[PDB]
Design an enzyme around this catalytic site. Structure first.
Site, PDB file in Angstrom:
ATOM      1  CB  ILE A  95      -1.145  -0.578   0.963  1.00  0.00           C
ATOM      2  CG1 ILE A  95      -2.129  -0.900   1.066  1.00  0.00           C
ATOM      3  CG2 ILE A  95      -1.790   1.546   1.567  1.00  0.00           C
ATOM      4  CD1 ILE A  95      -2.924  -1.383   2.418  1.00  0.00           C
ATOM      5  CG  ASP A  97      -4.045   2.527  10.054  1.00  0.00           C
ATOM      6  OD1 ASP A  97      -4.241   0.612  10.072  1.00  0.00           O
ATOM      7  OD2 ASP A  97      -4.329   2.801  11.265  1.00  0.00           O
ATOM      8  CG  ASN A 137      -7.312  -1.965  18.370  1.00  0.00           C
ATOM      9  OD1 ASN A 137      -7.351  -1.660  18.807  1.00  0.00           O
ATOM     10  ND2 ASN A 137      -7.595  -3.288  18.003  1.00  0.00           N
ATOM     11  CD  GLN A 166      -2.161  -2.064   6.817  1.00  0.00           C
ATOM     12  OE1 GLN A 166      -3.014  -1.365   8.085  1.00  0.00           O
ATOM     13  NE2 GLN A 166      -2.108  -1.257   5.918  1.00  0.00           N
ATOM     14  CD  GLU A 167      -3.948   1.396  13.818  1.00  0.00           C
ATOM     15  OE1 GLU A 167      -3.597   0.115  14.855  1.00  0.00           O
ATOM     16  OE2 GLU A 167      -3.947   1.892  13.522  1.00  0.00           O
ATOM     17  CD  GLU A 168       0.474  -3.104  15.503  1.00  0.00           C
ATOM     18  OE1 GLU A 168       0.149  -3.096  15.058  1.00  0.00           O
ATOM     19  OE2 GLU A 168      -0.553  -2.856  16.833  1.00  0.00           O
ATOM     20  CG  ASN A 200      -6.036 -10.330   2.624  1.00  0.00           C
ATOM     21  OD1 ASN A 200      -6.637  -9.619   1.466  1.00  0.00           O
ATOM     22  ND2 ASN A 200      -4.931 -11.453   2.270  1.00  0.00           N
ATOM     23  N   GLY A 235      -8.884  -6.229   8.816  1.00  0.00           N
ATOM     24  CA  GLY A 235      -8.929  -7.689   9.404  1.00  0.00           C
ATOM     25  C   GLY A 235      -8.487  -9.213   8.760  1.00  0.00           C
ATOM     26  CB  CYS A 236      -7.550 -11.371   6.363  1.00  0.00           C
ATOM     27  SG  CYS A 236      -9.211 -10.986   5.620  1.00  0.00           S
ATOM     28  N   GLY A 237      -6.295 -12.469   7.850  1.00  0.00           N
ATOM     29  CA  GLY A 237      -5.117 -13.475   8.870  1.00  0.00           C
ATOM     30  C   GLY A 237      -5.394 -13.127  10.236  1.00  0.00           C
ATOM     31  CB  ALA A 238      -3.890 -13.207  13.795  1.00  0.00           C
TER      32      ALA A 238
HETATM   33  C1  LIG Z   1      -1.785  -4.756   1.467  1.00  0.00           C
HETATM   34  N1  LIG Z   1      -0.695  -5.341   2.721  1.00  0.00           N
HETATM   35  C2  LIG Z   1      -1.274  -5.677   4.221  1.00  0.00           C
HETATM   36  S1  LIG Z   1      -2.191  -7.408   3.658  1.00  0.00           S
HETATM   37  C3  LIG Z   1       0.385  -5.673   4.961  1.00  0.00           C
HETATM   38  N2  LIG Z   1       0.208  -6.987   5.742  1.00  0.00           N
HETATM   39  C4  LIG Z   1       1.296  -6.581   6.927  1.00  0.00           C
HETATM   40  S2  LIG Z   1       1.732  -7.319   8.008  1.00  0.00           S
HETATM   41  C5  LIG Z   1       0.809  -8.228   8.385  1.00  0.00           C
HETATM   42  C6  LIG Z   1      -0.085  -8.433   8.738  1.00  0.00           C
HETATM   43  O1  LIG Z   1      -1.114  -7.838   9.378  1.00  0.00           O
HETATM   44  N3  LIG Z   1      -1.039  -9.124   9.652  1.00  0.00           N
HETATM   45  C7  LIG Z   1      -1.088 -10.825   9.402  1.00  0.00           C
HETATM   46  C8  LIG Z   1      -1.487 -11.499  10.649  1.00  0.00           C
HETATM   47  O2  LIG Z   1      -2.021 -11.062  11.878  1.00  0.00           O
HETATM   48  C9  LIG Z   1      -2.772  -9.747  11.451  1.00  0.00           C
HETATM   49  C10 LIG Z   1      -2.633  -9.074  10.287  1.00  0.00           C
HETATM   50  N4  LIG Z   1       2.347  -5.178   6.193  1.00  0.00           N
HETATM   51  C11 LIG Z   1       1.097  -5.318   4.619  1.00  0.00           C
HETATM   52  N5  LIG Z   1       1.110  -4.321   3.816  1.00  0.00           N
HETATM   53  C12 LIG Z   1       2.440  -3.214   3.808  1.00  0.00           C
HETATM   54  C13 LIG Z   1       0.507  -3.894   2.748  1.00  0.00           C
HETATM   55  O3  LIG Z   1       0.078  -3.300   2.123  1.00  0.00           O
END
Ligand SMILES: Cn1c(=S)c2[nH]c(SCC(=O)N3CCOCC3)nc2n(C)c1=O
Ligand SMILES: C[As](C)(=O)[O-]
Length: 501
Positions: free
Chosen positions: A266, A277, A280, A294-296, A409, A411-414
């Site tokens: 992103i 973002d 939370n 991602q947010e942090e 994605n 709100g996905c993953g964990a």
């Molecule tokens: C589209 N996109 C996505 S999806 C992304 N995820 C992350 S970090 C991993 C994460 O957030 N998780 C994994 C499981 O635990 C809950 C969520 N950095 C991201 N960036 C920069 C991004 O452009």
């Protein structure tokens, strides 16, 4: 292919797609903390007013430099005395912070800060930290009353309000957060500010996670940059709360365009787009504590985002926070246990006519689902649609002047969200807000193909937002409501079969 759908070059981006901004001016719904009449490219903004004005009440930030910040003695005088001492060892910094935080001397652990300084940094790096970086951070923190002269209103629940402040003002506030000087923001059982995120950085200093040195490297990169050369731009923070939400089942709007790719991010590949973002409800999540997804990560590489925690009440279901102008100061690799600070980043984004970097981020918080099937409940699907719609909608703007949404994605993953459902939800909300979608699947090539295939299927058949929402409702009733922890048939196969039959 690495990407499918509309070429990303065909998507709208700022600044090219934007309308000329109105004159920046304070008003009932817009706090502006600098002299607009003196705002000039490449010049440090001048605070307005010229002399510090204080408000110590339930509607504004309680500033550490307030004469009402007492302990009676003046806590600001105590902060000054504590921080204007030579630091040569990490215990010196711990002792200084605790001098005006005596009630927390047994509650706050500094192990990560001690370990960073003594056990991670090389000798020359530690020397630079205590001889240069920390003293410069102290000086900008103690300059607060001359920098942040105007009371900062809280962006409280249900407020539609904006704050525009300078990057230099943010730097002084964040230095104060690092030194844990914000009063009334610490107690575990506090009533006041219980609905606000943590702002003081004490939890960054706790524990032995290998993640803490990486967070500290990232933040000290920022502090070294902004104390050495004052940033010259502005940042706007806007809380947005919508009352009129679509009757989704009756929405006759067509879907908009999609670019979907399993490569890129992103923040790098969505330049000039509305960047999501995955927030939370307490904006920034665990950025100041243990979180590192991602947010942090975004809050660490663009630390001006962190100051939203000073004044942004927890988001209700119909609300979002929109931040325009934050600058990227670091590059990184990985996430969570693999997150590593890579290097300093020189942000090359253009600035707009308010001297804000052309970077717009929207914090929208997804729901957490302990049970997978709970997210297909209509009330929960509508909640997520309305949250994304609030994040994407700009009420007074033609669609031609709206950048694409850059997301993934959410709100996905964990967190339990189903990526295929959440992709369709964001596609529907974007369509209702008249914006195209740029979707990053973050390495998942099968998901890229599945989203593309569904989007093309629905668009070629001219299904409207309401047609698709009604299919989601049918999926819930047919495969979820009376259902095993998992449904018998997955969402996209159900949709294909329902439409083709
Ligand atoms: C589209 N996109 C996505 S999806 C992304 N995820 C992350 S970090 C991993 C994460 O957030 N998780 C994994 C499981 O635990 C809950 C969520 N950095 C991201 N960036 C920069 C991004 O452009
Ligand atoms: C009797 As029924 C399928 O509406 O719970």
């Amino acid at each position: 292919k690495k990407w499918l759908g509309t070429p990303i070059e065909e998507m709208r981006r700022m600044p090219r797609c934007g309308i000329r901004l109105p004159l920046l001016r304070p008003s009932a719904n817009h706090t502006v903390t600098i002299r607009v009449d003196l705002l000039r490219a490449g010049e440090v903004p001048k605070p307005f007013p010229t002399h510090y004005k204080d408000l110590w009440d339930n509607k504004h930030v309680k500033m550490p430099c307030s004469e009402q910040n007492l302990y009676a003695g003046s806590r600001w005088e105590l902060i000054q005395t504590a921080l204007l001492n030579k630091f040569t060892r990490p215990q010196n910094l711990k002792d200084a912070i605790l001098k005006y935080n005596v009630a927390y001397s047994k509650k706050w652990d500094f192990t990560a800060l001690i370990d960073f300084w003594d056990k991670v940094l090389e000798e020359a790096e530690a020397q630079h930290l205590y001889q240069s970086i920390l003293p410069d951070m102290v000086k900008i923190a103690l300059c607060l009353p001359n920098i942040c002269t105007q009371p900062i209103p809280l962006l409280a629940a249900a407020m539609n309000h904006s704050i525009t402040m300078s990057q230099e003002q943010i730097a002084s506030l964040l230095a104060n957060a690092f030194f844990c000087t914000f009063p009334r923001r610490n107690a575990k059982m506090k009533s006041e500010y219980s609905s606000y995120p943590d702002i003081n950085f004490n939890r960054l200093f706790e524990g032995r996670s290998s993640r803490k040195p990486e967070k500290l490297k990232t933040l000290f990169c920022y502090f070294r940059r902004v104390t050495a050369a004052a940033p010259t731009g502005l940042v706007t923070f806007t809380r947005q709360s919508l009352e009129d939400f679509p009757e989704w089942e009756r929405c006759e709007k067509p879907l908009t365009r999609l670019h979907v790719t399993y490569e890129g991010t992103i923040e790098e590949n969505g330049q000039g787009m509305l960047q999501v973002d995955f927030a939370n409800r307490f904006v920034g999540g665990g950025v100041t504590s243990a979180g590192l997804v991602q947010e942090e990560i975004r809050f660490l590489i663009n630390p001006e985002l962190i100051i939203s925690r000073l004044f942004t009440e927890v988001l209700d279901h119909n609300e979002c926070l929109i931040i325009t102008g934050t600058e990227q100061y670091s590059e990184y690799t990985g996430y969570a246990e693999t997150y590593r600070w890579s290097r300093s980043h020189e942000d090359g984004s253009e600035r707009d006519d308010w001297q804000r970097r052309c970077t717009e981020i929207v914090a929208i918080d997804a729901l957490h689902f302990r049970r997978y099937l709970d997210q297909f409940v209509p009330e929960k699907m509508r909640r997520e649609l309305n949250k994304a719609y609030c994040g994407f909608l700009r009420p007074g703007v033609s669609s031609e002047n709206l950048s694409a949404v850059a997301t993934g994605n959410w709100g996905c993953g964990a967190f339990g969200g189903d990526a295929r459902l959440k992709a369709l939800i964001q596609i529907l909300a974007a369509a209702a807000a008249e914006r195209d979608v740029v979707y990053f699947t973050f390495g998942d090539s099968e998901l890229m193909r599945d989203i593309y295939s569904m989007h093309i299927f629905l668009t070629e058949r001219k299904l409207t937002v309401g047609d698709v929402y009604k299919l989601l409702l049918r999926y819930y009733n047919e495969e979820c409501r009376n259902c095993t922890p998992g449904p018998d048939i997955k969402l996209y196969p159900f949709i294909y079969h329902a439409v083709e039959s």
